[PDB]
Each structure stands twice: as structure tokens, then as C-alpha cells.
Design a protein around this ligand. Sequence first.
Ligand SMILES: CCOP(=O)(O)OCC
Ligand SMILES: CCOP(=O)(O)OCC
Ligand SMILES: [Co+2]
Ligand SMILES: [Co+2]
Ligand SMILES: [Co+2]
Ligand SMILES: [Co+2]
Ligand SMILES: [Co+2]
Lengths: 323, 327
Amino acid sequence: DRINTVRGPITISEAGFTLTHEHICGSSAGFLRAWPEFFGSRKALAEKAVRGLRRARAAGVRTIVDVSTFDIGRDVSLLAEVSRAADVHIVAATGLWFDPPLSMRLRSVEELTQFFLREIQYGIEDTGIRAGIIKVATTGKATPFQELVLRAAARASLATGVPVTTHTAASQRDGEQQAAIFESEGLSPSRVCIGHSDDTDDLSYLTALAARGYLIGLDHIPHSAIGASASALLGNRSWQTRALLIKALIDQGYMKQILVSNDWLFGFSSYVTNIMDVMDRVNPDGMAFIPLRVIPFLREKGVPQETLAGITVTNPARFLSPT
Amino acid sequence: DRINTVRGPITISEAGFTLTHEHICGSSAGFLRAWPEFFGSRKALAEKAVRGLRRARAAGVRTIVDVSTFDIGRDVSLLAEVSRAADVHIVAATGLWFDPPLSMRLRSVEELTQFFLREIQYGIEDTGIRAGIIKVATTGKATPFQELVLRAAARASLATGVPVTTHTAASQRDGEQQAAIFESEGLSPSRVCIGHSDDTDDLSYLTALAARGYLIGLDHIPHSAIGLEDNASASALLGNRSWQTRALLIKALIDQGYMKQILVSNDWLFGFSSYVTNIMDVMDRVNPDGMAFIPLRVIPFLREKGVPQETLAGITVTNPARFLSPT
Ligand SMILES: CCOP(=O)(O)OCC
Ligand SMILES: CCOP(=O)(O)OCC
Ligand SMILES: [Co+2]
Ligand SMILES: [Co+2]
Ligand SMILES: [Co+2]
Ligand SMILES: [Co+2]
Ligand SMILES: [Co+2]
């Protein structure tokens, strides 16, 4: 009954309170190694990450799933270092996001499957650290390459038991096409999380997917720019409006299909220069936003602690456990 | 008279026969480390590189300039390993090619200048290995980002003396726009090489750049897809012009008095992941000599056509020496 982390295998019970969609650093392949000064220094980024993970730990978090893929600049050595120093388990990811380089974007579905399988079965780079989740993405209707990635993710999941988590443009209802592609491959809906689902107010869309067995990733809760580049990224909808979608799905009877997270980071190079400073001012709680602000909000709205423990401990454990 | 290599600083006289535009591996940032099995293994790629550079050294080559940038997946540790094993000097590169990731493409000209300067003045990654050349690219009309890269390359060159070398779509005459941007920043033409220039037969375009002081990169000499016209991918990359037609452009520029402006190379690699899967196997069958194609096939070709030995030695030894020297 084991889940692979950056420090090795852990049992289901060791996972505890788990944030299912997080990042230590949102970057690009090889960027942190080639230009650490962008983040001040590698040491400055690592120290910031340790403090943020310790804040989350003190708030109840025991494990985070870093959904940073190869093209998000996942540096598993950094993840292992910060995991050790902060005493928080970190599950690493394979897959591809929306910035694949030529060496990835010109590959066949068979080759992409081999790559995802290499990171889950053998390890990431020369570290021996095995991926425990597959991250994929669509920003509207899937491009021919994105469809290949979704199929390769499904094939890698079916061969390993490792789950698939997605980035969606929720307003364009991407989850429906993602679902259709995954099902055509024979992938069980219970092994898939349709992420960034709190970016929409269309409850019928979320309820329809949850009814089919999909996990609904309400992971953009602190992403709100109420009050230019930050307004186009975070949005105009409040955290309360996003958090009420958790309550709405519990009221529909789909508490077992909900996964909550912050989609936070401590370094962010894949956007405008001072974006990390803007994000830190919008949400000073960081990864601690879910246990410090969202859980007490839901408690005062009438949601029991047994249901909230089910969403934050039981659901991620069932999702991450290789099945 | 000191140039930076992957083994440390060497003197100008030690460079010798230099191939100005080469690659150990044409890939993408972080690719070699994440998926070495694409090339069989990192060990298989390293061994293939050592065998190729050893065959090139036996034929006369003493230095190769690896123009692989961050986005071409430059792994300086691999460059250092193969340089030492084959006893061939390798000059590493900074700059950005045409596949920059989001973290690079959203940067300002000032930020890009600081990155290029970091790789030249401090070192690449945590290796301490310093770049001795700046590689830039355009594929037709420059994109707003490519203009920023060209400007940052020029500013980095003016602060260090390190040369700039380019990738062009020669048929679209990219060298002219590149040249105009470099000169708008105050960069001297003698510090710039307009690469892939042998992809065109337009002698007027080549001679005009050479007259302004630009170095002409006739670096695609063995690139030909004749015999394999049924292979669309290989035809689009290598073209349908012979090595002789490409090599006759070296003779054409010598005859017009632009001897000091010529730089010859193979634009070869031992691993290639940034294109279709079968490409490295296709390319190795077209040119089994690899990087050894310039001293083995091209030099005796120009010798039988009437070109003197000191002229060819001036192109292969003196010109790269003057170009690579930080001035
Ligand atoms: C590094 C960026 O990660 P993300 O979760 O795609 O953020 C925008 C939704
Ligand atoms: C990865 C190398 O790319 P290039 O040298 O621009 O093209 C060679 C055919
Ligand atoms: Co996302
Ligand atoms: Co959003
Ligand atoms: Co994310
Ligand atoms: Co090129
Ligand atoms: Co090249």
C-alpha cells in the first residue's frame, strides 16, 4: 500500500492531509540550473520553500503533490531537499504541460508513453525518484499534440496504476473532451482529476463529471485579483465564490469526488518578472490558505469536520494509491 | 589572446584548425538528463561523440565551436567529458536559438543581457565553464522576442568582446535584418557570423555582407537530401543542393576577394532530438565522415579547383582565431 515520494515510498496512512495540486517552483526545463539568480539564488528559493512548507505543516498539511512536469521545470533534487528540511512529503509528477520543447512536441504517442513510464517505473533523471502522478493540460479544444499527451498519460496510468491530473480552461469546459479521450483509452474516471475546475460557475458541468466518477480539482481557491497581467491570470471572482463550489458539490452528494488545493508556488519564472511578489501580496498564507481560510469557512457554512477530513485525507489517499 | 573552452582558458595559437558551427547533441533544455534513453543512453551518446571527434582530430581538426544554446539542450558537462576524452578543444555557447521556453521568452532585453553575461563572465550552470560565443536565431522575419535576443547578444558582446554567431533562413535573406539590428546597438560587423549562408546561391547577398566586415558561415556543406526525395522530413531540413554546390560558394567568395570573411563548418551532431526520430540515422548515412567532412572531402575539393593551401589554412585557422579572440 505505497505511494512514491521524493524521499522514497510511504504508506497510505503516512500521507495524511494532502494538497493535491501544488508547485515548489513554476519554471521551465533546465531554467533553475542555468539561471538561479532569477530567483535571487537557489539557496534563497530553497529557504523560501522550506518556510512556506513549514507554515503549511503547522496548519495541518503533511503531504503536497508537486504537479510540476518536465516543462514546468521540475527539479526533483530541490523537491527532495525542501521535503527533508520541512518534514513534508512531496509527490513528484511526470507528464507534459503547455510548454513542451521541440524534443517533446515532435514525439509520437508511443514515445511519450515510454517517457512517462520511465519517470514512474525507473526514476526522474539520475535520482531514482519515481513520479507518483501524471500531469497533462489543455487550454480550450485539444491541439493534436495535447491529444497525444492525454493518450500517453492514459496508457502510462493503465500500466502503473498512477493517477492522472489535469490543467483545464474550465470556462471552455475542457473536462468534457479530456474525459472523452481518457475513456476512449479505457481509463477509469476514478484515476483522473479534472483540475482548475473552480474557474467556472457552471455547476451542471462539474456535477456531470463527478457523476461519471471523475475527481474534481477545486485548486485555484486563493487565485483572485480583486482590487493587468495579474488580473488576466488570477481573475475577478472571489475566493469565497470558489470555495462555495466545494459546499455545492457536497450538497449534490459528491464529497468523495472532491480534491482541494492552492496551486501555489515559491518561485515563478514562466510569467512576468515580479509576479511572485504580486501573488505573495494577494495570498500571504501561501499553501496554508486551504487549512487556514477555506476549512474554517466551510465549517461555519455547515460542513462537518468528518466531511472535510474525508476531502483532505481520504480522497487524496484513494486517488494517489496505485490502483 | 585567451579564449574560453570547456577545459578552461587556452591561447589563440593552440586553437589551430577550427570548425566554427558544430554540436555534440541537438536537443532541448533538460532533455538529455530527463530522457537519455532517447539516444540509447548518455554513455552511448558520449562514446559516439568521442569516436567522431577522434576521427575529426586524425583528419586535422583541433577545435570545434559547439553552438548549442540553453534551448538546444547544451549539456556542458557532456561537452567537457567528450572534449577531454577526444583531446579536441570545444568552445561552448550562450545565447538563445528558436525554441526558447516560457521562462526565457517572457524576459526583457536587460534580463536576457544579464543571462548571456552570466554564462560568459561567471559560468554555465554550476560548472564554472564559460561561454566563448553567443548563438542567436531567426527563421525568416524576426519575431519581437528574437529582436530582443539579437539586441541582448550585441550588448553582451560589447561588454565582453565575445563573438556572435547566427542561424538564418538564408533563402529569406535573414542576415540583412540581423545585421541591421546588430549595428543599431553599435556592434562591429567583425564580431558577427551570419550562419547557414550556404543554403542560398544568391552571391549578391553573401558578398554584400562580406564587404561590410561580416563573417560568412558556410556551415551546411554536407547537408544534402539527394537520393532521398521520398523522405519529406529529411528533404525539408537538409535541402536538395549537393555538397559540391555548397562548397563552390567558398571558392566564389575567395575569387571575389573575401578570403578573410569565410568560416567553414559541418553543423554536425551525434544526437538529434529536436526533429523527427529517424533523423540522426538518416544524416549519418548521408555523411559517414561526420565532422571530418571539411578536412577530408572539402579541402581536397578546393585544392583541385585551384585554391592555394595557405588560403584554405587562412580560412580554417586564421579566420576563426580572429573571430573567437575577445576584442
Ligand atoms: C506553473 C503554472 O501552473 P498552473 O497551475 O498552470 O498555473 C496557471 C493555472
Ligand atoms: C539542433 C541543431 O539545429 P540547427 O543546427 O539549427 O539545424 C541543423 C539541421
Ligand atoms: Co495549471
Ligand atoms: Co484559473
Ligand atoms: Co499548477
Ligand atoms: Co541552425
Ligand atoms: Co547548428
